[PDB]
Amino acid sequence: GKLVIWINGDKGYNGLAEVGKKFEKDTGIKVTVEHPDKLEEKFPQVAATGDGPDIIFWAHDRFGGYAQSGLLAEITPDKAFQDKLYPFTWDAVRYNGKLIAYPIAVEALSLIYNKDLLPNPPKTWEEIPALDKELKAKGKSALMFNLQEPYFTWPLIAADGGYAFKYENGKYDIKDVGVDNAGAKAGLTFLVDLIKNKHMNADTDYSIAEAAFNKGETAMTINGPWAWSNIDTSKVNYGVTVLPTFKGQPSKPFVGVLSAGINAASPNKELAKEFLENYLLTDEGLEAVNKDKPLGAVALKSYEEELAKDPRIAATMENAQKGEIMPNIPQMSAFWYAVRTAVINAASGRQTVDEALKDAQT
């Protein structure tokens, strides 16, 4: 008779509670929003026993596994409602040919540049090696971003053909991995060339890049919305824009889709569908959630146009559309363990790009 919703503690759960209050006003149904500790693990264990919340909020990548275990119920949005969200957001919530969650928010990396040092950021990766030489003459550096995580280096590596798992007919082919194809080889060759020519340092990590950019030492970095707040505290006159292209092809950052799934053990699935479609996934509900804690870019077209008036969210959405949707299969774990090693080995000069990428292929 009631709705119980779980959402991570870093999200605007108070705005979601306000949306639940509006739902209660319109229907009388009490909506209880919670932010349990250790939600990521907590949800699957409780759901496996037929318990847990009616609605669960999380990145789409995990939901696929939840769909394999039968913890998520198939959603039934009509064509009219499906037309309200960007198709690529729907692509992120598809498992075994069925929709298993409602896309809520879109998240992807973007190029953050210092306007004072770089009023006109480069549109191509090939411009960076020369652009750096200029800034080095002034005691600055063109670009510094986390190289320790594949999540940050993949956009350049997979710009011209690279991909984690082939995706077709709403299905991932785990036997088709494009780690060691020509595009990935060219991308990592460019990255290691940047390292070799001293335009970049192999040991640079998240902390070093963040400190360098926020102190005005480097003209550019690559980061997502989560870092914006820190930059705001630094008072750097910064802008967020699209990632540079490689060989004329857009950089393909991983796209994280915050989605809402319906518990398979929920006897109140119609109420969850009503709340999500007619109350949350609207301009008013998304605005209410946004006012508490920003969602960045959103899957709903109507509110996305309003949010895009700020160039930062517009750049985030444009990068996400050109990016690669995060696969929702467990095999990605191995991928994370594989390419990482390659980037560690290829960047260190100990292994060739061919060698490293072929070893990470298997």
Author numbering: 5 to 366
Task: Give the authors' words.
Here, we show that a generic and kinetically biased ‘Gembody’ (Gb) interface, previously discovered through trapping in crystallo, can also be trapped in solution by kinetically controlled side-chain-to-side-chain bond formation in a manner that leads to ready generation of complexes; these display ideally balanced interface flexibility and yet relative complex constraints, in turn allowing rapid cryo-EM structure determination, even of small targets. Ultimately, after a survey of in-solution covalent bond-forming methods exploring differing natural and unnatural amino acid residues, we found that Cu(II)-catalyzed oxidation at a pivotal C12 residue site (together with the presence of needed Gb ‘gem’ substitutions previously discovered through iterative X-ray-guided engineering) offered a route to direct and rapid, high-yielding formation of disulfide-linked homo Di-Gembody (homoDiGb) without side reactions (for example, off-site oxidation) to form a robust covalent interface. Furthermore, the success of DiGbs for high-resolution structural solution is enabled by their relatively small mass contribution to the imaged complex while increasing the maximum particle diameter for better particle alignment. In summary, our plug-and-play DiGb strategy improves cryo-EM resolvability and resolution of small proteins through constraint and increased particle size with a simple and robust workflow and can even enable simultaneous structure determination of two challenging targets in one dataset.
Strikingly, within weeks, using an essentially identical workflow to that used for RECQ5 and SPNS2, the homoDiGb method was applied to 43-kDa MBP and even very small 14-kDa hen egg white lysozyme, achieving reconstructions at 2.45 Å and 3.16 Å, respectively. Lastly, we also observed clear structural evidence for covalent bond formation as a driving trapping force for formation of the DiGb complex.
